[PDB]
Every structure is written in structure tokens, then in C-alpha cells.
Design a protein around this ligand. Structure first.
Ligand SMILES: NC(=O)c1ccc[n+]([C@@H]2O[C@H](COP(=O)([O-])OP(=O)(O)OC[C@H]3O[C@@H](n4cnc5c(N)ncnc54)[C@H](O)[C@@H]3O)[C@@H](O)[C@H]2O)c1
Ligand SMILES: NC(=O)c1ccc[n+]([C@@H]2O[C@H](COP(=O)([O-])OP(=O)(O)OC[C@H]3O[C@@H](n4cnc5c(N)ncnc54)[C@H](O)[C@@H]3O)[C@@H](O)[C@H]2O)c1
Lengths: 282, 284
């Protein structure tokens, strides 16, 4: 038949657990604290951030939200991170992506102390993951996807998996986590000649491209597992994914809704990571 | 169809060593004497021979080599302390541990203990991270790097291509795939758990094979005009060394193929040398 990969329900269960954890840390002096850094007033980024803070309060995590100017300098951005780096009351530090062009994204993410790198974008944490290690912080989206799939006991060893989209935020670590899980992985992107060739033979497809209706009924096999990471806003103001959900869901054994699939899972992983960092202080 | 072309890693590496030779003559005169440290734990015959050849390629091109030959049973701590000394020695530009290490020693711990600016094998987690992020400034693992140079030397366009990497190790497969993906190729990564290899190979413009399995890639798995890179090294009973590709049949359908021996091998070595001189050169 067909079964919804419902990250909404799943994330709620996680927040409950983190509620409990923080109470305990909070008693033992450790008040779990995420510092979020927002650059410029892009209302979409502002969206992700509001939600991020709202999630934190929901489950006893102290949010620190630095909404600073779009034009602030690299050194100012850097000096804030330095301070946060050495601020024992701060357990995670996250830069909201993307950043202004005049700023070197990599230097910035690399300058966050790797033990507070809750987004998992610091080179050494990327390295750990690509090595098959769980010795660090894993990026929240790909992590949320795995936790979700693992909740539905979807076995991954040996599957034919296709990741559509090759970004550092999603695609690449997604691929690495699948491959660490024993899956065969194909990574496709804007330059892939014929995407359908990979998608038709795929047991599992992760879509993370930023293109409305990129994945269609005639590109997927009956009983495919489809995870839709994409988030797009139409004229309607209506938020949809990269997958044509109507036509593709009829053919899927399991499939993420949008919204309510990967989104809430992303947020939940950001929370788990922040608390894992807090836990270490003990 | 056009004449098949041998991806001649032996000739290219000889050209590179010659370049490295001149670079070193220049660096000597600036008081920089490129120097590489190699650590060999135990008396593995294959490891031993790999080390000799590393030292010999070093001497060839004007790189001073230091070989540390340690007991099969030495402590994780003793090895860690040695690396520590080498990390701090300003006359050493490259540090390499010969793999594999004995079972009783944590490999990841060892490789991460090497200072990342002397990590000429590119196995330090931070160097693995730079690569995965798309930065090819730092240190890149030698084998997949040598594949890329070799392909580049033959002017092989990779943007948009269908590439299959067979094997998913940290030494070869995973960095190989990242570099092809960095170059704008679509990549598929297969390994021992893949259900069906021909699913991926039949469609491939480029196949990198790196599995340690004799005849893993046969002629009926590939399409006409395919480019086949053979990283494997296997010894048959007859003492002959072959790769993982069925070269005789597969080369008949290939537009470009690496022989074994003499393809990837000398390139892996040339890249360790290049990375070592890269570190030395950085001292200016
Ligand atoms: N908040 C969340 O839960 C969450 C977080 C991560 C990203 N997202 C969303 O998912 C999408 C992915 O984010 P990103 O940072 O990876 O974006 P990105 O633009 O940086 O990367 C896009 C990737 O998809 C590929 N691509 C684009 N169009 C394609 C096409 N028509 N065919 C094949 N490949 C194509 C690109 O080559 C690229 O590799 C975005 O729309 C983003 O809004 C959601
Ligand atoms: N020329 C050189 O100096 C040099 C350097 C690096 C490695 N190598 C050679 O490359 C080969 C692999 O090296 P490694 O370090 O990556 O070894 P490895 O054992 O760590 O990795 C093997 C990979 O290939 C896969 N594999 C094994 N058998 C397979 C099969 N039948 N079908 C599909 N996949 C299979 C494994 O699952 C694994 O992912 C070996 O022959 C090694 O000697 C050459």
C-alpha cells in the first residue's frame, strides 16, 4: 500500500526526551544553550530561525539569538564566534545559512570550535563522518533523515540509493551516511545528463535540489522509498517539496510529506546535538 | 573505432619526478630540503617493499627520506610519541604511516595524531573534511589524486560524465568519488554489498575499480568507449600481478584504460612526492 514518513510525530517524541534531559543538566548546573547567529533580514532565514528558537524553549534549551546586520564584517562575525567559543555557558553555535557574499563561508564555519559545531559543518566533523566515525557532530538534515528511516525499521544495507543534489548542507553528508549504512549510493546534480536513468532503478531516493516537481511518477519504480528534503514557496505562499507528491506517493512504499516530513526532523536533530554537547560538561 | 589508449602512469610519473627534481634544486638554494618521514610498523613483506620504493622514489627526485622501522609489537604510545617528535621537527615536511597497522593499534587515532600540515597521505580527519567540502587546496590522498592527474594529463573531460567507483575505502574509493564529484561528474559508489554491479557499470563513461578482486570487471559489464581505471593489485599464484579488471577483454571495448602494473601505481607514488614538496614549498 502506502505509508507516510511522518517526521512531525517523530520529532515530537524526541523533544519530550530532551525536555527531560535538560531538567537534569539544569539541576546539575548545566543549562543547555544554543547560540544562533543570523546575518541580515532575509525573512526565510528569519523563518528557520524563529522556529529554531521556538523549538529550543519548547524543550528547556536556552536560546541566544544574535540577529546582526547584513553588512557586518568578517572580523566582527569572527570575534563573536571567538567569544561564544570560550563562553562556557554556550553549548552549541550555529550560523544560519546562507551568509552575505562578502564573507568567506568556509572560514566562518571552520572558526566555530568543533565541540560546539552542532550543524556539523566544521571540516574536522565532516572528516569524521566521511571516515565512518560517530566521534563528532553530524549535519542535522541528513541525520534527521536517517533517524526517521530507522524509526520505520527501513533496512538500508544493500539498497540502491540515489541522492539528488550534492550540497555540503545535505547531499554530500546524506550520501555518506547512506554509504556508512551499507547502501549503494549515486549522487546526482544539475549536471547529471539523465536523472531518470538513476531514479527508475532506485530503491530509495533522497531529493534535495530546490526544484519544484523535479521528481515525477515516471521517474520512480513501484514501491520506491522517497525522502523529500526540498522546501519551496509557490505563488500560493503554499510550501511544497521537490517531489510531485500527488503522482509519486501513489507509487511509494514510504514517502515524506511536505511539510511535516524532514523539516521537523532537521529541527529535532539540532536540538539533540545541542544537548549532547551540554551532556559532555559532566 | 579509434585506437584504444593506454593511460600511461609510468611515463607521467617520470615526467612529474623530473619536475619535482628541479623544484627541489630550487628549494635547496632557499635552504629548504624537502624531507619525508615514513613509519613502518612490523615486517609485512608487501609493506616492506612499498616502503623501499617510497624511499627510492624520494632519493630520485631530491627528497630526503627518513625511514623508521618499528617492532610489530610496539605500543600505541611509543608510536604516538614518535609522531609527536616528528610533528615538531621543522626539518620534516611530510609524515606518513605505512598501512596496515597491527590489530592492537587504533588506526584512526594514529592518523589523526599526525599534524595536519605534514599529513601528505591526506588521511587526517581535517584533510578528509576539506576534500568533502570541495576545497582541493590542502592535502589530497595520493591514489585518487594520481588518478585525477592521470585523467587530466590525457585531457579527459569529466563534467557531466557517468562515473562508477567500485570500492568504498578511506584510502581510495571515498576520496576518489569525492574528487570526481568535485569535478562535476555524477558518481555512483559500489562495494561488496551492492546487489548488482552491472546495473551501474553498463551505463558508465568512467569506471574506477578498487576492490582487490581478480576479474571483478569483465567485458560484458561495460559499454563501448568506456574509460577504465584499475587501482587493484592482486598476486596470482604464478607470481604475476594483475589488477581487478579483466584487462584482455575489457581493453578491447575501452577508449582509455590503465595497464597493471604501470598505471595507477607509479602515480600514487608520484603524488606522495608532490604532496611532500608541497609541504616543503609552503615554508616560504
Ligand atoms: N530546512 C530544512 O528542513 C532543509 C534544510 C536543508 C535544505 N532544505 C531545502 O532543500 C533544498 C536543498 O538545499 P541545498 O543547500 O542542498 O541547496 P543547493 O542549491 O546548495 O544545492 C542544490 C543541489 O541540487 C542540485 N540541483 C539543482 N537543481 C537540479 C535539477 N533540476 N536537477 C538535478 N539536480 C539539481 C544542485 O546541483 C545542487 O547540487 C533547498 O531547496 C532547501 O530550501 C531544507
Ligand atoms: N597501487 C597502489 O599503490 C595502491 C594503493 C591503494 C590501494 N591499492 C589496491 O586497491 C585495492 C583496494 O584497496 P583498498 O585499500 O581500498 O582495500 P579495501 O579492502 O579497504 O576496500 C575494498 C573495497 O572494495 C569493495 N569490494 C571488495 N570486493 C568486492 C567485490 N567482489 N565487489 C564489489 N566490491 C568489492 C569493498 O567492499 C570495499 O569497499 C587493493 O587491491 C589494494 O591493494 C593500490
Amino acid at each position: 500500500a502506502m505509508t507516510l514518513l511522518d517526521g512531525k510525530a517523530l520529532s515530537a517524541k524526541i523533544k519530550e526526551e530532551l525536555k527531560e534531559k535538560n531538567q537534569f543538566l539544569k539541576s546539575k548546573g548545566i543549562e543547555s544553550c544554543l547560540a544562533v547567529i543570523l546575518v541580515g533580514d532575509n525573512p526565510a532565514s528569519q523563518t528557520y530561525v524563529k522556529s529554531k528558537a521556538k523549538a529550543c524553549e519548547e524543550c528547556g534549551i536556552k536560546s541566544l539569538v544574535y540577529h546582526l546586520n547584513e553588512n557586518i564584517t568578517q572580523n566582527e562575525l569572527l570575534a563573536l564566534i571567538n567569544t561564544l567559543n570560550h563562553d562556557d555557558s554556550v553549548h552549541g553555535i550555529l550560523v544560519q545559512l546562507p551568509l552575505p557574499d562578502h564573507i568567506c563561508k568556509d572560514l566562518i564555519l571552520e572558526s566555530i570550535i568543533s565541540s560546539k559545531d552542532v550543524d556539523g559543518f566544521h571540516p574536522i566533523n565532516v572528516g569524521y563522518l566521511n571516515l565512518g566515525l560517530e566521534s563528532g557532530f553530524l549535519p542535522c538534515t541528513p541525520l534527521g533523515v536517517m533517524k526517521l528511516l530507522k524509526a520505520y525499521e527501513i533496512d538500508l544495507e544493500g539498497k540502491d540509493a540515489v541522492i539528488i543534489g550534492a550540497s555540503n548542507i545535505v547531499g554530500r553528508p546524506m550520501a555518506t551516511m547512506l554509504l556508512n549504512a551499507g547502501a549503494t549510493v549515486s549522487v546526482c546534480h544539475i549536471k547529471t545528463k539523465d536523472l531518470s536513468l538513476y531514479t527508475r532503478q532506485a530503491d530509495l531516493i533522497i531529493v534535495a535540489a530546490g526544484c519544484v516537481n523535479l521528481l515525477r511518477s515516471d521517474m520512480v519504480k513501484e514501491g520506491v522509498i522517497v525522502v523529500d528534503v526540498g522546501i519551496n514557496r509557490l505563488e500560493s505562499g503554499k510550501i511544497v517539496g521537490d517531489v510531485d507528491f500527488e503522482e509519486v506517493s501513489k507509487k511509494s512504499s514510504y514517502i515524506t510529506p511536505v511539510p511535516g516530513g524532514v523539516g521537523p526532523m532537521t529541527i529535532a536533530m539540532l536540538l539533540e546535538n545541542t544537548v549532547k554537547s551540554a551532556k559532555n560538561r559532566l
